[PDB]
């Protein structure tokens, strides 16, 4: 169950990031929306900065160092 919830949450964050990137890059000339950086079409597990990149700094610090700093 935790695995399934994790995939759904990650996919939701990726979709929101895609929507906001598409909104943001409507005017830049050579850009392409949601373009991969890999030659392969295999699924690549996203980084920490891919999901939380467009979010606030508080949640960024949480998602980065919450387990490390929790004592």
């Amino acid at each position: 169950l935790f695995q399934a919830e994790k995939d759904r949450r990650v996919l939701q964050m990726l979709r929101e990031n895609l929507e906001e990137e598409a909104i943001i890059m409507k005017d830049v000339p050579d850009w392409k929306v949601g373009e991969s950086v890999f030659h392969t079409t295999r699924w690549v597990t996203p980084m920490m900065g891919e999901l939380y990149g467009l979010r606030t700094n508080e949640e960024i610090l949480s998602a980065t160092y919450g387990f490390i700093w929790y004592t």
Binding site: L1, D7, W43
Partner: protein
Amino acid sequence: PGIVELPTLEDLKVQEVKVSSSVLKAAAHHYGAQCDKPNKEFMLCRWEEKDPRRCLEEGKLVNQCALDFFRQIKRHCAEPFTEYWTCIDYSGLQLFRHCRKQQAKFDECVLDKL
């Protein structure tokens, strides 16, 4: 080179299970014993496809089956179960060992009920 494909936000909508970790831990054994088949579907498909985008339906299925399990537990023994989870929640490490007596009750209730 290429565009990534992500499922729309509607495809990720499902009735999330809304209990805490202690509640899940208290009924973990019965959850595994009763909800094993859809969980095995989801886990095998997840380890075969290696793709989260190809395992949504099985996730919805396991959430639905977990909801069915919790609905039965709520219907049949709300009082016995509530006392047991509460004890688990109090412990910092959520140890099964600390409150054996509560478990004996819940188990027998379930053994009588379901």
